[PDB]
């Protein structure tokens, strides 16, 4: 029944600083330890610090040594983790962690992860994708649709309100030097004898507040 | 610790010889 | 309970920097990690174990630890022991020592003695779970115990067989007596506030006579033996110093006098602690040699000779640094929860 | 000291096979090796510690040997639930450093991808911003080529591949070789084309006209 949940993800511009939220419950959140680890896509793992929770004492990296300040307050069972002087390779995926509640030691391996909170260090300033079809004109047609310019993530990409989910993956997203957000969203029938089928896709930018729907035929 | 050397000394002493570790003592 | 007493190969851990050639650092380099920023120390409910400092495997793990630090540091251009000698070189440095942690490994936990005043032996109320030992200093010392820990409340006075004159008496003191060496041939000489020395000396017989039905307590010289147990050894950045106490134990005062002189000699050639042998090593340069340690407890030796008489002798002992290390691991105990 | 080094970054793997995950160290922390999972998407979560102790509700074909200086985290009998990154780490104290990181595969069979060129459309030509999607379908490894060739010469960069994560059932990556350009700069040529390698002869396809 231990719950270490983050919030939400974050988009600053650079040298602006984020403060991360981290609610623990079902254990006494003073005893142990609240450890903040994070991951730039394409990267691998990197433990920033640890904090004290009944007593603040707090150690964090050389690399992140100055810009993190892991704060807390026990009134609220939360903890904190700013980022100041905030760089752009300094957007990832932020989550705080603990050990195994036990009154023992030693065991001090993160066990309880968080949910996980984007850090997007960028000026985008929200933007919506324009949404254009990817018809072609030969063995199992393929098509799609191309959401392009759209700030930030995450997108949705529901192709005819779930159902066609057969051989139909949207691809990751790309940064193009603009700074706004573009993926492509493929889906392939059988053959190309039954290319019959309507397809209507559905676009979701939360953010943005549109999910407008466009029909893919040649 | 040589002990029976350490009292074979420690006798010119009129003394028991005892190990103080690698160490000669007397008492 | 749910752990069990059990021996393992404990880590070390002190905080040494490799910017720094003085040998102690160099050697802390490998062999032992960084020390812990936020060390845990979790209250073990409310019961009570039963510690032994007398058999503990932390002392003999930290007796090879530093025997190596020795003898891989301060390597003797000549070591000869009961077989053999090995011919090597004699470099100059320095020694100033670094607290050192030592650490459980994998599933074990340290159990740790915070009793007021403990003796390292029987019940043990306050017990405790920590990862690491604490900051002790490796200091080879003879006679009186310097650069180390302080007992919190009274004077403590501790050892296996209190009766039997075989079992080494540790003194371990409530305050910490300044003493000041230096070397400015080789003789070199030490100096002692006596008023607080000889004032501090007064309530350690006084505790020392209420574990001997209120008998009387005398001091006395060393009867006898090896330099290194009649001398007060230890090694001062570098050289093997050699100081006659005798004026800080000639019974007596306790306005006779203030401050405390013992000669002292510097020998090149001494047996070692290591094991039964001895070895030459290097002489020095004219370095005004000198170490300001904190005098923190003495080993003593009783006589032959308890109902008769109604007084007690006691005299300076060591020669086995084992007790050096279980004046400051007194506190700790392995345990296995795998 | 300490440096951890996690020995492989990504390895092949038929399914049902034993695969050994190494991590080695600079000095001994007494054996307080952690093994985590990140599957791909997910939060990670914590498999084998101290060294070898497995976790509760935990598959057992994960195995936590090595120990000191020289750690192992071996799976025989491979599977498909058995994919992500899995880093070790060291908890004695902190600092909590964990190594770089190890990817799993699933070998599969030499699957050739599927070449398909999706022109600008309409309303993509209205704006000044135009993107011509390239996209090899289905395929098996991920060392795969897209070379696009506008007028039969070469277009250097300006191109953005965005490949998926390797599918349960095929064990096969999609790719999205997209390539944005500008009205003068799409209409100051129109023969466009998509070059592919991987596994064959070569498979480039193209598209003239508006
Ligand atoms: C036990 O540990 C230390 C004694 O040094 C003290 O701070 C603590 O309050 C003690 N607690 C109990 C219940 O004895
Ligand atoms: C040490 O203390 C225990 C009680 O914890 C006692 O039984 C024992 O006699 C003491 N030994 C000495 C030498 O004081
Ligand atoms: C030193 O210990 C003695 C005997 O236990 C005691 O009488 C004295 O008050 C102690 N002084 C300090 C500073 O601890
Ligand atoms: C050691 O102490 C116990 C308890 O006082 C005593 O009975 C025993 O005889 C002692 N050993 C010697 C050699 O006197
Ligand atoms: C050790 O000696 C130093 C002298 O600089 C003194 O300041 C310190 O308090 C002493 N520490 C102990 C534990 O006696
Ligand atoms: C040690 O004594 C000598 C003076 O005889 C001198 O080096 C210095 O004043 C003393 N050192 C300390 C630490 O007091
Ligand atoms: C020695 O210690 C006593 C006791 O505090 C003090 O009064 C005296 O001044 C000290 N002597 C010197 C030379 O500092
Ligand atoms: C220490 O000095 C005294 C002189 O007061 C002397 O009698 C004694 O023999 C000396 N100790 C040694 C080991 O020579
Ligand atoms: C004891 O510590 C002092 C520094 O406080 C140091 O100068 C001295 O060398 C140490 N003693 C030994 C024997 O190393």
Redesign the interface.
């Known amino acids: 029944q231990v719950q270490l949940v983050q919030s939400g993800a974050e988009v600053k511009k650079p040298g602006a600083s984020v403060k991360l939220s981290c609610k623990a419950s079902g254990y006494t959140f003073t005893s142990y330890d609240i450890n903040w680890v994070r991951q730039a896509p394409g990267q691998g793992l990197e433990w920033m610090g640890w904090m004290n929770p009944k007593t603040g004492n707090t150690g964090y990296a050389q690399k992140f040594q100055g810009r993190v300040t892991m704060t807390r307050d026990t009134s609220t069972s939360t903890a904190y983790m700013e980022l100041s002087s905030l760089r752009s390779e300094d957007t990832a995926v932020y989550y705080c962690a603990t050990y195994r509640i036990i009154a023992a030691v030693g065991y001090r391996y993160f066990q309880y992860w968080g949910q996980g909170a984007l850090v997007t260090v960028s000026s985008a300033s929200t933007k919506g994708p324009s949404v254009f079809p990817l018809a072609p004109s030969e063995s199992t047609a393929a098509l799609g649709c191309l959401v392009k310019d759209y700030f930030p993530e995450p997108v949705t990409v529901s192709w005819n309100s779930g159902s066609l989910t057969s051989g139909v993956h949207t691809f990751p997203a790309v940064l193009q030097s603009s700074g706004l957000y573009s993926l492509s969203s493929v889906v392939t029938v059988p053959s190309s004898s039954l290319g019959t089928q309507t397809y209507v896709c559905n676009v979701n930018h939360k953010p943005s507040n549109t999910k407008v729907d466009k029909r893919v035929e040649i | 610790x040589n002990l029976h050397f350490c009292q074979l000394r420690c006798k010119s002493l009129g003394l028991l010889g005892r190990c103080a570790x690698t160490y000669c003592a007397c008492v | 309970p749910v752990w069990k007493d059990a021996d393992t190969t404990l880590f070390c851990a002190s905080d040494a920097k490799a910017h720094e050639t003085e040998v102690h650092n160099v050697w802390a380099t490998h062999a032992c990690v960084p020390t812990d920023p936020n060390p845990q120390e979790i209250h073990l409910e409310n019961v009570t174990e039963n510690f032994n400092m007398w058999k503990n495997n932390m002392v003999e793990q930290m007796q090879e630890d530093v025997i190596s630090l020795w003898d891989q540091s301060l390597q003797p251009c000549v070591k000869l022991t009961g077989g053999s000698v090995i011919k090597q070189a004699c470099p100059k440095i320095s020694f100033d020592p670094i607290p050192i942690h030592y650490c459980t490994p994998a599933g074990y936990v340290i159990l740790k003695c915070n009793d007021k005043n403990f003796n390292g032996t029987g019940p043990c109320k306050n017990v405790s779970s920590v990862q690491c030992t604490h900051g002790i200093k490796p200091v080879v010392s003879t006679q009186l115990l310097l650069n180390g820990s302080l007992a919190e409340e009274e004077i403590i006075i501790r050892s296996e067989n209190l009766t039997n004159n075989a079992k080494t008496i540790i003194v371990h003191l409530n305050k910490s007596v300044e003493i000041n060496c230096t070397r400015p041939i080789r003789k070199a000489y030490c100096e002692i506030n006596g008023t607080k020395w000889n004032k501090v000396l007064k309530q350690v017989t006084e505790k020392l006579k209420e574990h001997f039905n209120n008998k009387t307590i005398i001091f006395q010289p060393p009867s006898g033996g090896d330099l290194e147990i009649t001398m007060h050894s230890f090694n001062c950045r570098g050289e093997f110093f050699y100081c006659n106490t005798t004026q800080l134990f000639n019974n007596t005062c306790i306005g006779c006098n203030g401050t405390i002189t013992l000669p002292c000699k510097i020998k090149q050639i001494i047996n070692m602690w290591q094991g039964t042998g001895q070895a030459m090593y290097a002489p020095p340069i004219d370095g005004k040699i000198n170490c300001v340690s904190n005098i923190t407890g003495i080993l003593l030796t009783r006589d032959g000779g308890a109902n008769n008489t109604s007084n007690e002798t006691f005299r300076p002992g060591g020669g086995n640094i084992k007790d050096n290390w279980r004046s400051e691991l007194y506190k700790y105990k392995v345990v296995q929860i795998e | 000291?300490?440096q951890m080094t996690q020995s492989p970054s990504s390895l092949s793997a038929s399914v049902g096979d034993k695969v050994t995950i190494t991590c080695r160290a600079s000095?001994?922390?007494?054996?307080?090796l952690?093994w985590?999972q990140?599957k791909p998407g997910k939060?990670?979560?914590?498999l084998i510690?101290?060294?070898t102790?497995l976790?509760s509700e935990v598959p057992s074909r994960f195995s936590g040997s090595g120990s000191g200086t020289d750690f192992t985290l071996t799976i025989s009998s491979l599977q498909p639930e058995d994919v992500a990154?899995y880093?070790c780490?060291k908890?004695?104290?902190?600092?909590?450093?964990?190594?770089?990181?190890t990817r799993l595969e699933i070998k599969r069979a030499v699957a050739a991808p599927?070449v398909?060129?999706?022109?600008?459309?309409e309303?993509?030509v209205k704006?000044g911003?135009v993107?011509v999607?390239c996209?090899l379908?289905n395929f098996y490894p991920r060392e795969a080529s897209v070379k696009w060739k506008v007028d039969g010469v070469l277009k250097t960069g300006n191109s953005?591949?965005?490949?998926?994560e390797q599918?349960s059932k095929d064990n096969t990556y999609?790719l999205?070789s997209?390539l944005?350009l500008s009205n003068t700069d799409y209409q100051s040529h129109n023969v466009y084309a998509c070059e592919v390698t991987h596994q064959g002869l070569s498979s480039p396809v193209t598209?003239s006209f508006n």
Do not use: M
Request: aromatic letters at 16%; charged letters at 10%; hydrophobic letters at 30%.
């Open positions: 000291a300490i000095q001994g922390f007494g054996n307080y952690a985590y990140q939060v990670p979560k914590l510690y101290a060294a102790t976790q990154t880093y780490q908890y004695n104290s902190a600092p909590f450093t964990f190594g770089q990181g599927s398909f060129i999706f022109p600008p459309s309303d993509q704006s911003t993107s999607v996209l379908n953005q591949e965005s490949v998926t599918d999609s999205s997209t944005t598209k």
